[PDB]
Amino acid sequence: TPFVIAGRTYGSRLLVGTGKYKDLDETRRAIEASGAEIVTVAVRRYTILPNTAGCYDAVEAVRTCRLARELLDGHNLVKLEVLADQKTLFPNVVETLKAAEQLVKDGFDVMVYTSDDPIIARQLAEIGCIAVMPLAGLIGSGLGICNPYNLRIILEEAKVPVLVDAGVGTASDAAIAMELGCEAVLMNTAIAHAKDPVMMAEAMKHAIVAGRLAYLAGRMPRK
Amino acid sequence: TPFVIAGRTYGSRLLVGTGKYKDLDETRRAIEASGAEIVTVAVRRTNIPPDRYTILPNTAGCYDAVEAVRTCRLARELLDGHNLVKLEVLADQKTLFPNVVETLKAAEQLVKDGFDVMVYTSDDPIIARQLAEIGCIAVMPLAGLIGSGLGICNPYNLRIILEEAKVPVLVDAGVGTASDAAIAMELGCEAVLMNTAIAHAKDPVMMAEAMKHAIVAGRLAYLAGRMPRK
Numbered sequence: 001t002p003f004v005i006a007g008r009t010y011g012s013r014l015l016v017g018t019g020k021y022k023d024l025d026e027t028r029r030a031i032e033a034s035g036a037e038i039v040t041v042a043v044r045r046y047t048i049l050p051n052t053a054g055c056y057d058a059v060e061a062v063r064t065c066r067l068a069r070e071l072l073d074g075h076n077l078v079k080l081e082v083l084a085d086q087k088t089l090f091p092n093v094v095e096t097l098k099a100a101e102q103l104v105k106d107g108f109d110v111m112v113y114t115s116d117d118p119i120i121a122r123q124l125a126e127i128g129c130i131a132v133m134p135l136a137g138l139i140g141s142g143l144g145i146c147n148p149y150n151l152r153i154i155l156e157e158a159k160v161p162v163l164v165d166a167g168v169g170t171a172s173d174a175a176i177a178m179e180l181g182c183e184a185v186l187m188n189t190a191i192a193h194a195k196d197p198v199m200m201a202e203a204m205k206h207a208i209v210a211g212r213l214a215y216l217a218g219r220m221p222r223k
Numbered sequence: 224t225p226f227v228i229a230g231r232t233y234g235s236r237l238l239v240g241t242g243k244y245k246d247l248d249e250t251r252r253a254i255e256a257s258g259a260e261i262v263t264v265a266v267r268r269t270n271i272p273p274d275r276y277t278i279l280p281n282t283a284g285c286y287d288a289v290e291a292v293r294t295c296r297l298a299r300e301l302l303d304g305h306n307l308v309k310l311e312v313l314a315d316q317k318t319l320f321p322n323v324v325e326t327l328k329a330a331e332q333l334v335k336d337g338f339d340v341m342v343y344t345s346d347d348p349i350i351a352r353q354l355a356e357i358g359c360i361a362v363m364p365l366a367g368l369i370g371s372g373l374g375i376c377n378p379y380n381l382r383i384i385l386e387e388a389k390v391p392v393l394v395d396a397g398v399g400t401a402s403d404a405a406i407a408m409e410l411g412c413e414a415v416l417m418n419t420a421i422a423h424a425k426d427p428v429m430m431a432e433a434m435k436h437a438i439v440a441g442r443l444a445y446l447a448g449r450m451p452r453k
Contacts, residue, residue: 084349088383092349094324115347116377119314119322137379147346147377149367153318 001216003183005038005161006077006109006130008047012037013178014208015163016201017188019045026197033201034191040079043068049111051079056092058082058099065103078103079133081113089139093120097127104128113165116150118157125160132160133186136177137167140189144173148180155181171200171207178211179219224446226414228261228391229307229339229360231277235260236408237438238279238393239431240418242269249427256431257421263309266298278302279341281309286322288312288329295333308333309363311343319369323350327357334358343395346380348387355390362390363416366407367397370419374403378410385411401430401437408441409449 003013016036021027031039038047043064044054050068055061061082069075082099084092091114103110104127111131112124121132134154137143144167145151155162161184164177168190177185185208194200226233239259244250254262254271261277267284280298285291291312299305312329314322321344333340334357341361342354351362364384367373374397375381385392394407395416407415415438424430 088348090347090349090383093347094327094350097324115345117320117323117345117347118318119320120324123324143379146379149373149376153320 005111010037010047012205013184013212014174014204015040015049015165015184015186016191016204017186018042020188020192021197027192030191030198030201033198033205035205040186040188043071047077048072048075049077049079050075051113052081052099053083055082055099056084056095058095058102061095061099062102062106065108066106069108076107076109077111077130078108079111079113080129091115091135093117097123100124100129101127111163116147116154118150118153121154122157125158129160131163131183132158133163133165135166136164136173137169139166140193141167142169142190142193143167144169145176145180148176151180168204171203174204174207175211175214178208179215181215184208228341228414233260233277235435236414236442237404237434238263238395238414238416239421239434240416241265241271243418243422244427250422253421253427253431256428256435258431258435263416263418266294266301270301273302277307278305279307279309280305281343282311282329283313285312286314286325288325288332291325291329292332292336295338296336299338306337306339307341307360308338309341309343310359321345321365323347326350327353330354330359331357341393346377346384348380348383351384352387355388359390361393361413362388363393363395365396366394366403367399369396370423371397372399372420372423373397374399375406375410378406381410398434401433404434404437405441405444408438409445411445414438 012035015038016034018041040049040051042053043050052061052064082095110129116134137146163184165186168187191200235258238261239254239257241264263279263281265283266280282291282294312325340359346364354362367376391413393414398417398420421430
């Protein structure tokens with residue numbers, strides 16, 4: 001089917017992050033290999049997805065978004081990302097709800113990072129948000145899907161696109177995400193931190209397409 | 224060791240629920256077998272000897288902080304000013320998943336209202352952090368959805384909550400069998416709370432005895448310090 005976000009339709013269902021590589025040659029050759037169409041960048045540090053990485057308040061996230069919307073010539077596409085603390089890098093869903101509401105009535109097209117909590121993921125799509133992106137595992141933990149149960153509920157009732165964002169460890173992790181029903185996946189550390197970044201990219205490139213086909217194909221039951 | 228909650232210290236680390244059995248004979252014989260000392264009841268849908276047990280009135284059925292807060296006041300006076308309450312603000316009768324925003328709302332109100340709150344919540348480690356900050360005697364993240372009999376669904380988040388827990392942590396609801404509860408204790412929980420796993424087993428009173436050993440076995444294993452994984 002068609003992978004459409006905020007009106008625009010894309011080919012690659014593999015969003016990819018930046019800033020974790022060793023240099024531009026690498027990130028260039030990598031996100032090139034990943035086959036990604038949308039690539040997110042941490043403003044505070046094709047289709048570019050400015051994300052508020054680094055923010056800890058709705059007020060900070062909201063300001064970073066305004067200041068990125070004007071550096072990108074009024075582009076409303078933003079990845080809201082209000083974290084709790086530099087330690088767990090776990091989302092502060094209360095502040096995220098705060099900022100998400102503010103950003104929506106401010107003309108933005110928000111793709112919001114969040115926990116696997118299915119009810120807060122519900123409200124985020126209600127107050128707007130083009131897409132809700134529950135995490136797979138903690139950021140940079142390379143753990144993969146840690147709560148497939150909650151992930152299924154979020155997908156079952158998702159009224160907007162669902163993207164598993166962050167926490168991925170290898171190809172299979174991403175394949176599984178798609179198999180569960182995600183519209184796309186977003187990763188950074190899994191690629192940029194593999195011994196050979198450019199290959200992991202090509203791997204995920206196939207990883208997310210393989211699982212996406214498997215989802216649509218409708219797998220056999222279990223004896 | 225001693226299981227202490229809100230000053231009081233108990234022997235059984237197995238809290239048990241009510242209302243899921245077939246009759247009083249059953250629930251009586253069951254929570255009796257479970258060995259539980261603290262037994263929770265859904266005030267809004269159920270009105271056992273309080274000279275034998277510590278009763279934990281819970282706001283099951285509430286969907287707002289306003290409703291949970293009202294049920295708690297009306298249960299605090301039916302129990303002769305007892306401040307022990309299990310805050311439980313759910314999202315919808317479907318998922319029966321906690322509405323952490325409303326729970327934060329009510330938890331704050333209840334704490335500055337003299338209550339001793341044991342709060343039901345998600346496995347979100349940061350909201351579990353704030354709940355202990357705004358007061359709360361104990362934070363009780365779920366194991367699995369209520370009545371899903373799924374057990375620990377997110378041991379990762381569960382570990383973080385335990386690592387940074389500044390108050391007692393009780394895995395509440397979602398349990399499926401004995402091993403599920405044993406695992407919870409092994410992870411580091413101070414106690415466990417269940418209802419459906421016991422009252423819904425083919426033979427409720429036995430499952431009770433099972434969990435009775437289940438939570439003690441895992442609790443000893445935690446303290447014993449298990450061998451590594453070669």
